[PDB]
Amino acid sequence: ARYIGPKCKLSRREGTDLFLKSGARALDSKCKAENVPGQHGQRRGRLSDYGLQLREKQKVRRIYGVLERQFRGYYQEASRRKGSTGENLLQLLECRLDNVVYRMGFGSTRSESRQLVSHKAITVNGQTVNIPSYQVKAGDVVAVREKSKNQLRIAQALELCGQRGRVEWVEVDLDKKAGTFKSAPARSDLSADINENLIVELYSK
Amino acid sequence: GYIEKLVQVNRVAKTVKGGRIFAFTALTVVGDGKGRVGFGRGKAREVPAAIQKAMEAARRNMIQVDLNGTTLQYPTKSAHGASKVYMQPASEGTGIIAGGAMRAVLEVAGVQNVLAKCYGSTNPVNVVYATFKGLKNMQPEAVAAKRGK
Amino acid sequence: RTLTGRVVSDKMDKTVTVLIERRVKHPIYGKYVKRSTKLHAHDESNQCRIGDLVTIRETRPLAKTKAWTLVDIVER
Amino acid sequence: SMQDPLADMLTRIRNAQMAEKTVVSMPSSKLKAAVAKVLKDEGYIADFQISSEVKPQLSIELKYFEGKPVIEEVKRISRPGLRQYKSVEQLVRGGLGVSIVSTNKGVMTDRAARAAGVGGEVV
Amino acid sequence: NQLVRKPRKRMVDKSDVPALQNCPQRRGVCTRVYTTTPKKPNSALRKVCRVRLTNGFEVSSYIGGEGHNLQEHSVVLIRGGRVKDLPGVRYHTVRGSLDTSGVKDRKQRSKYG
Amino acid sequence: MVTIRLARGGSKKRPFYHLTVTNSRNARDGRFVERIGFFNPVATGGEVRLSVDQERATYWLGQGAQPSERVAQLLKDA
RNA sequence: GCAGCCGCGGUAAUACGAAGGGUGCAAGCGUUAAUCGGAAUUACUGGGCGUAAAGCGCGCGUAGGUGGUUCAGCAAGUUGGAUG
RNA sequence: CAGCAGUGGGGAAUAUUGGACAAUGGGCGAAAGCCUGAUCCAGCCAUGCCGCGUGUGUGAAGAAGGUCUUCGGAUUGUAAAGCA
């Protein structure tokens, strides 16, 4: 593997939020942010194609937490399945089990939804799945195992379900902490800061 | 045309008594994404004063391309000089799997299922004429053979 | 069950030699070429002549290198 | 010597579409100069009028279809090895006016079961 | 018909690494260790080792350190790769079957503080 | 003897058998005459345990082929 | 000293060797070797030969390759289906 | 030993003198069984390939140590040493 280390220094690069933080607030105030990662990022130039194709692959790949081994295989199961591989790439990243623990809201962000599925706290259909790559299917419960319920940062993570906006392709019973992966999203339910087809542009050079 | 796009810029030279006097040449394509494309060449001593002239001359000499809707009409072949260009249709999920100087002309005509390939010379000022003649010389229903097929 | 050839030799006792022409397609260039087979057949009545068009069928080997027999002379 | 006569049709046609000649006459033969019937049924009409007694010359009445002709590229013949003997793997260029076929039973194109020969496209 | 009577023969491409016959590395012994001078635009005093390879072949390899100690009968491994300045060398002595030393810190093939 | 016996497909600790009809002189993983259906000892829900195709097993037991001792105690599952 | 190519280095070095500080991709990561690709650079698909490499110095001719037109038959190539 | 393991040797380079016949073979037996380095398995090795592993949806307290003066600023830039 996972990216670990400094997560303040991540979000300057590409530009937006990317949701990689620590508590209850927002984006971009206590780490004095107006500038660029690099050797000297105080003068710029030439924000065009290849380096923005490679921003576009590497913006997605730092949200979800894949490395390029898994991510290039997600290009394979896009170009294998029929029709619209740019959206196929994003549905595969949204059916991911540590992504859904975020999209259900039982986890704080994805890198503590990765670490919450991995310590065997999430059940899918009455079992234990601890792989944060388990593709979930249309109509699976994604519940929480009943040994990690009274540990409060599970429940303390449930409040930005309302404050980040409703996801509106799950349903989640907060009484038993048990979601239901209702269906996969399509490319109007995902944020518009990403350019889905500029990863397909970064394949044959 | 409003999705302009530069292809190549070249520092060309000339000798006088004093020595090499320089001038920059830009080749630039201009389209609208719907089947209208011109290409333009211009020269100036500075880079952006020549790109402008390449934008200018490409907004005149534009051509209505008789496409099928996001693809080519039929697999075609064209050539200007030693440059030779094969273009065809693709199905629906493909993009512009051509490349280089053919990628710009087959982007600003609003095609996005190409699968084009160029042989012979790869000099982009003749590859651009050779793509331009393939696109100018198609017709889907304007067969004069008096039929429905 | 049958090949058909032109007799190209008679000079052996009780043995005739036919050429069986076949036009195969070339495996890479696609030209249809002539391509030849020179079999030995068994004419026990010793009566095929150089130039005869004959029909041969396949039998058990009658000599070394001789495993076809004469069926029927087509034309002469 | 002259030893491909229906590539001499398609060249006498092509060189007169390249000029603005009205009529092409040529001393050509039976059913593979009713390639000319196929080419100027699917296509247009002519008079086309094979007309003599012992030098039966056929006369394609080419016409010019507004501005610049409708035969752009024809030839694509076979004579040796240049060839189509296909089983459908035959031409589909626009899927239109496709490719004259020259084999065993009747000169046609793309309608019945199968069995290729050779010719070449209107456009 | 001309192609049918003799087809198109493809041209073989010889190796530009003739010694070490289809092998990644191949050890030899240093015949002689010396310096020679680069081709016309460049100028340095670049350390070569003429090595007698264990195939019986006898090639000149480059020593790409920042200072070495291949002392006239050492037992180097060589690998392919031309040095463009030195006319007529085709190999590099790899750095780590005998010696590696220095600072390098921006490593392989190197040493490890 | 022509014999009817099991051939190991599958993987390590996850066996899978094939009910081949072979020569009994051949190796147990190659050169069979036919394969009548499988047998799967680690089958679970959705996976069959045996598919033993009793019209060709009747042909070969007609021709005088020998089941082994497990194939004999798997054609008693009918 | 670098370097796969263009090439770098001769006094402010983004190319050589470094703590001021990070783009990869990660239990990997690099460079050697080999293989095909890009190579339409052996071109059948799909190339050329006045001047870039490339028309024998010219004939005549053996094998071969190819062959005008019409009616008929034939059914080896061709074509369709079936079966193995 | 061109059976398995292992040696010296060559070489850029490639393993354990292992366990059991428990399974599926095969061999003799009427059977019990007795054999079986086939095999099923354990060693060793990133050699491949797949998966996984290194606590917080925050906050100046902008600690030092690392700086240049852009002598306020950029730089570790919605970080920690607290934690439920």
PDB file of N, CA and C in Angstrom, chain B residues 73-77 137 139-140 142-147 149, chain D residues 41-44 65-66 70 72 93-97 111 123:
ATOM      1  N   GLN B  73     -16.430   6.223 -43.476  1.00  0.00           N
ATOM      2  CA  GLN B  73     -17.509   5.637 -44.252  1.00  0.00           C
ATOM      3  C   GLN B  73     -17.145   4.261 -44.794  1.00  0.00           C
ATOM      4  N   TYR B  74     -15.954   4.099 -45.350  1.00  0.00           N
ATOM      5  CA  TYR B  74     -15.471   2.810 -45.825  1.00  0.00           C
ATOM      6  C   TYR B  74     -13.958   2.784 -45.664  1.00  0.00           C
ATOM      7  N   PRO B  75     -13.333   1.597 -45.656  1.00  0.00           N
ATOM      8  CA  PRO B  75     -11.871   1.554 -45.606  1.00  0.00           C
ATOM      9  C   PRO B  75     -11.259   2.156 -46.849  1.00  0.00           C
ATOM     10  N   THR B  76     -10.360   3.103 -46.629  1.00  0.00           N
ATOM     11  CA  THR B  76      -9.881   3.930 -47.722  1.00  0.00           C
ATOM     12  C   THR B  76      -8.365   4.024 -47.684  1.00  0.00           C
ATOM     13  N   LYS B  77      -7.813   4.461 -48.805  1.00  0.00           N
ATOM     14  CA  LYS B  77      -6.384   4.588 -48.976  1.00  0.00           C
ATOM     15  C   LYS B  77      -6.101   5.841 -49.765  1.00  0.00           C
ATOM     16  N   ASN B 137     -12.682  12.696 -50.220  1.00  0.00           N
ATOM     17  CA  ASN B 137     -13.061  11.870 -51.353  1.00  0.00           C
ATOM     18  C   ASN B 137     -13.872  10.675 -50.879  1.00  0.00           C
ATOM     19  N   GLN B 139     -18.115   9.424 -49.937  1.00  0.00           N
ATOM     20  CA  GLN B 139     -19.519   9.702 -50.175  1.00  0.00           C
ATOM     21  C   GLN B 139     -20.363   8.491 -49.755  1.00  0.00           C
ATOM     22  N   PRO B 140     -21.325   8.675 -48.829  1.00  0.00           N
ATOM     23  CA  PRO B 140     -22.146   7.540 -48.398  1.00  0.00           C
ATOM     24  C   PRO B 140     -23.410   7.269 -49.206  1.00  0.00           C
ATOM     25  N   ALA B 142     -24.157   9.603 -51.984  1.00  0.00           N
ATOM     26  CA  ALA B 142     -23.986  10.452 -53.153  1.00  0.00           C
ATOM     27  C   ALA B 142     -23.369   9.678 -54.308  1.00  0.00           C
ATOM     28  N   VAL B 143     -23.524   8.362 -54.293  1.00  0.00           N
ATOM     29  CA  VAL B 143     -23.376   7.581 -55.509  1.00  0.00           C
ATOM     30  C   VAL B 143     -24.413   8.055 -56.524  1.00  0.00           C
ATOM     31  N   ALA B 144     -23.953   8.298 -57.746  1.00  0.00           N
ATOM     32  CA  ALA B 144     -24.835   8.776 -58.793  1.00  0.00           C
ATOM     33  C   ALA B 144     -25.491   7.628 -59.523  1.00  0.00           C
ATOM     34  N   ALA B 145     -24.977   6.411 -59.323  1.00  0.00           N
ATOM     35  CA  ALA B 145     -25.623   5.180 -59.752  1.00  0.00           C
ATOM     36  C   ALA B 145     -27.007   5.186 -59.126  1.00  0.00           C
ATOM     37  N   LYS B 146     -28.025   5.196 -59.976  1.00  0.00           N
ATOM     38  CA  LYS B 146     -29.366   5.569 -59.559  1.00  0.00           C
ATOM     39  C   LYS B 146     -30.090   4.440 -58.841  1.00  0.00           C
ATOM     40  N   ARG B 147     -29.630   4.125 -57.638  1.00  0.00           N
ATOM     41  CA  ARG B 147     -30.142   2.989 -56.888  1.00  0.00           C
ATOM     42  C   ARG B 147     -30.376   3.439 -55.448  1.00  0.00           C
ATOM     43  N   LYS B 149     -29.025   1.169 -53.165  1.00  0.00           N
ATOM     44  CA  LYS B 149     -27.774   0.550 -52.702  1.00  0.00           C
ATOM     45  C   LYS B 149     -26.683   0.649 -53.767  1.00  0.00           C
TER      46      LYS B 149
ATOM     47  N   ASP D  41     -25.619  -3.077 -65.613  1.00  0.00           N
ATOM     48  CA  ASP D  41     -26.884  -3.135 -64.887  1.00  0.00           C
ATOM     49  C   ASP D  41     -26.758  -2.467 -63.528  1.00  0.00           C
ATOM     50  N   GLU D  42     -26.011  -3.088 -62.621  1.00  0.00           N
ATOM     51  CA  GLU D  42     -25.754  -2.515 -61.306  1.00  0.00           C
ATOM     52  C   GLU D  42     -24.733  -1.414 -61.434  1.00  0.00           C
ATOM     53  N   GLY D  43     -25.197  -0.180 -61.379  1.00  0.00           N
ATOM     54  CA  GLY D  43     -24.545   0.875 -62.112  1.00  0.00           C
ATOM     55  C   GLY D  43     -25.617   1.669 -62.811  1.00  0.00           C
ATOM     56  N   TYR D  44     -25.681   1.583 -64.137  1.00  0.00           N
ATOM     57  CA  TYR D  44     -26.583   2.400 -64.949  1.00  0.00           C
ATOM     58  C   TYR D  44     -27.212   1.560 -66.046  1.00  0.00           C
ATOM     59  N   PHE D  65     -21.139  11.169 -64.680  1.00  0.00           N
ATOM     60  CA  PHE D  65     -22.129  11.231 -63.637  1.00  0.00           C
ATOM     61  C   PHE D  65     -21.790  12.363 -62.686  1.00  0.00           C
ATOM     62  N   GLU D  66     -22.733  13.289 -62.560  1.00  0.00           N
ATOM     63  CA  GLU D  66     -22.490  14.730 -62.683  1.00  0.00           C
ATOM     64  C   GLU D  66     -21.123  15.219 -62.212  1.00  0.00           C
ATOM     65  N   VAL D  70     -18.183   7.958 -62.420  1.00  0.00           N
ATOM     66  CA  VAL D  70     -18.478   7.121 -61.263  1.00  0.00           C
ATOM     67  C   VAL D  70     -17.548   5.928 -61.162  1.00  0.00           C
ATOM     68  N   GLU D  72     -14.274   5.142 -60.360  1.00  0.00           N
ATOM     69  CA  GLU D  72     -12.994   5.656 -59.892  1.00  0.00           C
ATOM     70  C   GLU D  72     -11.889   4.631 -60.044  1.00  0.00           C
ATOM     71  N   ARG D  93     -15.969  -3.458 -50.163  1.00  0.00           N
ATOM     72  CA  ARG D  93     -15.326  -2.141 -49.961  1.00  0.00           C
ATOM     73  C   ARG D  93     -16.131  -1.071 -49.232  1.00  0.00           C
ATOM     74  N   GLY D  94     -17.249  -0.655 -49.807  1.00  0.00           N
ATOM     75  CA  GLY D  94     -18.298  -0.049 -49.028  1.00  0.00           C
ATOM     76  C   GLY D  94     -19.440  -0.999 -48.766  1.00  0.00           C
ATOM     77  N   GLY D  95     -19.318  -2.258 -49.159  1.00  0.00           N
ATOM     78  CA  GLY D  95     -20.446  -3.160 -49.186  1.00  0.00           C
ATOM     79  C   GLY D  95     -21.369  -2.871 -50.345  1.00  0.00           C
ATOM     80  N   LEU D  96     -20.896  -2.112 -51.324  1.00  0.00           N
ATOM     81  CA  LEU D  96     -21.736  -1.545 -52.363  1.00  0.00           C
ATOM     82  C   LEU D  96     -21.167  -1.939 -53.719  1.00  0.00           C
ATOM     83  N   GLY D  97     -22.042  -2.228 -54.704  1.00  0.00           N
ATOM     84  CA  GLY D  97     -21.698  -2.435 -56.122  1.00  0.00           C
ATOM     85  C   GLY D  97     -20.544  -3.372 -56.446  1.00  0.00           C
ATOM     86  N   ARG D 111     -25.387 -12.121 -54.337  1.00  0.00           N
ATOM     87  CA  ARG D 111     -26.809 -12.269 -54.028  1.00  0.00           C
ATOM     88  C   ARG D 111     -27.217 -13.692 -53.630  1.00  0.00           C
ATOM     89  N   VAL D 123     -16.894   1.938 -57.687  1.00  0.00           N
ATOM     90  CA  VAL D 123     -16.168   3.033 -57.040  1.00  0.00           C
ATOM     91  C   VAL D 123     -14.964   2.519 -56.288  1.00  0.00           C
TER      92      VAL D 123
END
